[PDB]
RNA sequence: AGGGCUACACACGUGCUACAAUGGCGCAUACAAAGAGAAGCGACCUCGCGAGAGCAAGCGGACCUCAUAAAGUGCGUCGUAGUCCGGAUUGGAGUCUGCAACUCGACUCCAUGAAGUCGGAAUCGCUAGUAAUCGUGGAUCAGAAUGCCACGGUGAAUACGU
RNA sequence: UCCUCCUAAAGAGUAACGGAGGAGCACGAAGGUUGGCUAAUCCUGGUCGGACAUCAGGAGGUUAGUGCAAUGGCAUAAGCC
């Protein structure tokens, strides 16, 4: 809970000063981090989806939830209810630990990392970023890797706007370019 | 958390070359030997035309 | 095994393994290994962590991987924006060093496109 | 390319024309046939109309061009494609 | 004077280099023939990773120079991989000839590392110091050969027969 | 032969070789009950990923859904688990 204790001990005060909030409850919070793997290659091979789930479990520390097609789509040859991905919702202690591991270990291991886009906010202070290769997480062993897979990471926050979301993330020294 | 279905999640030590050590819970199982970390990566730290070269090569 | 942001082969000789890095050839591999005080035939997996760190330091003096790729793209785009002959050749996907195009030129033109 | 010890080649008539035009200000394009002359920093801002075999091609010299030859900016062959 | 003969959807001929282990790479070390050279061949030395550069002998030559022959042989490594095979393409930095290397030169260094894993139908050469393979030299020529002409090294298979 | 709507004149019923569509099943769960849940579509952000897969948020408010026509219903859902 290093980053949560840092949030409470420093980031709250910093944001209160920076935005002049009238109550401490008004400070943006990091609510949840969701990791998503869109596994379209599972349409023909189910071991692909199972291996994606194993990668996600290794990375996040949580057994993932297999997601299924909401509607049938000819364009991707998918019928309704077909499992085509996996996600994990990280909250609380697990979420702060993953935030720390991401920031301090995984992002530094991104090939040719020149800084995360600061425009990748959804308009309400929530940040999403892509990963192209799961090896950037040390939990994934390099010489056991079957297929190259990435994932999506979303950080949902209680920020009313993108500027407050970016300030909240920057307070953790998020690697914004 | 539901019992008996999640990966093993226990603390390890991440040792970087620059001498940074972080104690992080992980599913990796063993200790880590990082080649880089947030405290030493060039982008994190801050460590990251023709007339000039024409004059340098053709000094008169 | 992780140098310059990529995984080096572990079972190869070090002199061969380092050439996995975009921007290190054989001459640079030999020079890096001489300047890190490591024999050329030593496999990566017989190297210590101090040795791998010295190798990383030696690689640090060169422009490699993503930085080198950015440099190369910058030079090519500079040519292509200049509108010079070399830039136009780059634009058209044709040989840029005065080679014949009546025949051959297939590395640049790609496989034959029949009429 | 040309040996460094020999310096960069430029035709004397062109160098003189460029000096005159720089002194007098910014004249109309200087017509030259010296495709082989290097582009010097003191030509930046001038317009040099460079022969490509049949017509002079107006070259607006920028800083990126310095050290290149004038003929690199006046293509000599007309190609638009086969079967068009 | 500048441009073109060097264009490039494409078709064909003649070649070069390969696809590797009967090989690649590193170190060491053997054995040729033929030829050319005065606006030429240019040693030794010094500088440079190198192409080269500076200085400067000798030689109109069985004398001097071009001018380590290479394949080979020993030692070591790579261990069948698009690889330590291949070396096209492209970026950067250079050298030299030449008034001048943009179009459009050769060569060097660093980086890059494509196709190609032996080739459909068809088709060529070769009967012995031949084929195959390996280097070497010369003319043209300021510079510019994978072409041409010439020279040695290693060195086969097979011909029942009509 | 059977179902739905209109013709049909605000109860029911009402004809024509009038105007339009469907059925001749399906389901041991798609039945019973208890607990829970809430749609379409669009916008923004997000590895491959694209007009369209999965993820996050917003807008919207049933424009969805209903095993199969059409009508009448359906949120206390009759819709989803
Ligand atoms: Mg090289
Ligand atoms: Mg040519
Ligand atoms: Mg003429
Ligand atoms: Mg011709
Ligand atoms: Mg000669
Ligand atoms: Mg090779
Ligand atoms: Mg292939
Ligand atoms: Mg092979
Ligand atoms: Mg005969
Ligand atoms: Mg030969
Ligand atoms: Mg010659
Ligand atoms: Mg009635
Ligand atoms: Mg009535
Ligand atoms: Mg009646
Ligand atoms: Mg219910
Ligand atoms: Mg029911
Ligand atoms: Zn570090």
What ranges do the domains of chain A cover?
A: 3-172
Q: Max Cα separation, chain B?
A: 80
The CA-based angle B33-A59-A35, given to 5 degrees, is 140
- State, as a whole number of angstroms, the distance between the CA of C80 and the C1' of E103: 17
The position carrying tokens 């008169």 is B60
Distance spanning both ends of chain A, measured CA to CA: 26
Q: Which two tokens stand for residue B26?
A: 């992980």
| Contact between residue D35 and residue D69 where contact means Cβ atoms under 8 Å apart | yes
Nucleic strand E within 7 A of Cβ C88: no
Helices C49-60, C26-35: inter-axial angle, 10-degree rounding? 120
Resolution (A): 2.0
The per-residue b/e assignment along A60-96, b for 16 or more CB within 10 angstroms, e otherwise, is: bbbbbebbebeeeeeeeebeeebbbbbbbbbeeebbb
As a whole number of angstroms, the distance between CA C98 and CA C93 comes to 13
Q: Which two tokens stand for residue D28?
A: 């109309």
Instruction: Provide the 8-state DSSP code for A57.
Output: H
Q: Which domain holds residue C32?
A: 2-65
Nearest nucleotide, C1' to the C-alpha of A157?
A: F57
Q: Which two tokens stand for residue A64?
A: 């993932």
Residue of C nearest to B18 (CA): C53
Q: Which domain holds residue D60?
A: 2-82
Cβ neighbours of residue A38 under 8 Å, at least 6 residues apart?
A84, A85, A152
As a whole number of angstroms, the distance between CA B3 and CA B6 comes to 7
Please tell me the experimental approach by which this structure was elucidated: cryo-EM
DSSP bridge pairs for A116: A176
DSSP bridge pairs for A127: A121, A155
Q: Which of C 37-76 have CB under 7 A of nucleic chain E?
A: 41, 68, 71-72, 75-76
Q: Which fold would CATH assign to domain A3-172?
A: 50s Ribosomal Protein L5; Chain: A, (3.30.1440)
Nucleotides of E under 7 A from a protein CB: 1-13, 77-79, 84, 88-98, 100-106, 109-114
Q: Which two tokens stand for residue A159?
A: 């920020």
Nucleic strand E within 7 A of Cβ C100: yes
The structural domain count of chain D equals: 1
* Backbone angles phi and psi of A30, in degrees to 5: -90, 110
* Backbone angles phi and psi of A152, in degrees to 5: -110, 140
As a whole number of angstroms, the distance between CA A42 and CA A48 comes to 6
DSSP bridge pairs for B11: B25
| Contact between residue D75 and residue C85 where contact means Cβ atoms under 8 Å apart | yes
Number of C–D residue contacts, CB under 8 Å: 18
Contact yes or no, C with D (3+ CB pairs under 8 Å): yes
Sheet (strand D47-51) strand order: D30-32, D47-51, D56-60
As a whole number of angstroms, the distance between CA A96 and CA A58 comes to 16
Cβ neighbours of residue D13 under 8 Å, at least 6 residues apart?
D32, D34
- State, as a whole number of angstroms, the distance between the CA of A124 and the C1' of F41: 21
The position carrying tokens 């500027």 is A163
As a whole number of angstroms, the distance between CA A7 and CA D44 comes to 56
As a whole number of angstroms, the distance between CA A24 and CA C75 comes to 52
Give the β-pairing of C2-3 and C6-7.
antiparallel
Q: Which of D 9-48 have CB under 7 A of nucleic chain E?
A: 9, 33-36, 38
| Contact between residue A136 and residue A109 where contact means Cβ atoms under 8 Å apart | yes
Distance spanning both ends of chain C, measured CA to CA: 50
Nearest nucleotide, C1' to the C-alpha of A43?
A: F53
Query: Count of alpha carbons within 13 Å of C114, Cβ hemisphere only?
Result: 0
- State, as a whole number of angstroms, the distance between the CA of A176 and the C1' of F9: 76
With 0-12 CB in 10 A as exposed, 13-18 as middle and 19+ as buried, what is D55?
Answer: exposed
The position carrying tokens 């910058």 is C74
As a whole number of angstroms, the distance between CA C23 and CA C34 comes to 17
Q: CA of C71: how far to CAs of A117, C67, C75, C90, D11, in Å?
A: 21, 6, 6, 16, 33
Is B18 annotated for ligand binding? no
The per-residue b/e assignment along D27-46, b for 16 or more CB within 10 angstroms, e otherwise, is: eebbebbbbebbbbeebbeb
| Contact between residue B17 and residue B34 where contact means Cβ atoms under 8 Å apart | yes
Instruction: Provide the 8-state DSSP code for A21.
Output: -
Cβ neighbours of residue A85 under 8 Å, at least 6 residues apart?
A36, A37, A38, A39, A42, A49, A52, A66, A67
The position carrying tokens 């040996």 is D3
Contact yes or no, A with D (3+ CB pairs under 8 Å): no
| Contact between residue A109 and residue B36 where contact means Cβ atoms under 8 Å apart | yes
């Amino acid at each position: 809970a290093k980053l949560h204790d840092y949030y409470k001990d420093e980031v709250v005060k910093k944001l209160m000063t920076e935005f002049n909030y009238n109550s401490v409850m008004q400070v943006p919070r990091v609510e949840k981090i969701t990791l998503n793997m869109g596994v379209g290659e599972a349409i023909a091979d189910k071991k692909l989806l199972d291996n994606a789930a194993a990668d996600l479990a290794a990375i996040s520390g949580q057994k993932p939830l297999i997601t299924k097609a909401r509607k049938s789509v000819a364009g991707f040859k998918i019928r309704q209810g077909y499992p085509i991905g996996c996600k994990v919702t990280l909250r609380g202690e697990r979420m702060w630990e993953f935030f720390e591991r991401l920031i301090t270990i995984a992002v530094p291991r991104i090939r040719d990392f020149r800084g995360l886009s600061a425009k990748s906010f959804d308009g309400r202070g929530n940040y999403s970023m892509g990963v192209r290769e799961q090896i950037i997480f040390p939990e994934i062993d390099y010489d056991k890797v079957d297929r190259v897979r990435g994932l999506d990471i979303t950080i949902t926050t209680t920020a009313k706007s993108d500027e407050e979301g970016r300030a909240l993330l920057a307070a953790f020294d998020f690697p914004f370019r | 958390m539901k019992k008996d279905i999640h990966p093993k999640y226990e603390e390890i030590t991440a040792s970087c070359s620059c001498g940074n050590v972080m104690k992080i819970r992980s599913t990796v199982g063993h200790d880590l030997n990082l080649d880089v970390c947030s405290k030493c990566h060039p982008f994190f730290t801050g460590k990251q035309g023709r007339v000039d070269r024409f004059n340098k090569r053709f000094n008169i | 095994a992780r140098i310059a942001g990529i995984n080096i082969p572990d079972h190869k000789h070090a002199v061969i393994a380092l050439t996995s890095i975009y921007g290190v050839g054989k001459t640079r591999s030999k020079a890096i290994l001489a300047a890190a005080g490591i024999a050329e035939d030593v496999k990566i997996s017989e190297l210590s962590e101090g040795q791998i760190d010295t190798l990383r330091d030696e690689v640090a003096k060169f422009v490699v991987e993503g930085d080198l790729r950015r440099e190369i793209s910058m030079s090519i785009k500079r040519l292509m924006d200049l509108g010079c002959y070399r830039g136009l050749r780059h634009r058209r996907g044709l040989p840029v060093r005065g080679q014949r195009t009546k025949t051959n030129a297939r590395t640049r033109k790609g496989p034959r496109k029949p009429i | 390319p040309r040996s460094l010890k020999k310096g960069p080649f430029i035709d004397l008539h062109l160098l003189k024309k460029v000096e005159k035009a720089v002194e007098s200000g910014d004249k109309k394009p200087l017509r030259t046939w010296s495709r082989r002359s290097t582009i010097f920093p003191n030509m930046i801002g001038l317009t040099i109309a460079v022969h490509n075999g049949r017509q002079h091609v107006p070259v607006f010299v920028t800083d990126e061009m310095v050290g290149h030859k004038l003929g690199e900016f006046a293509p000599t062959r007309t190609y638009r494609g086969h079967a068009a």
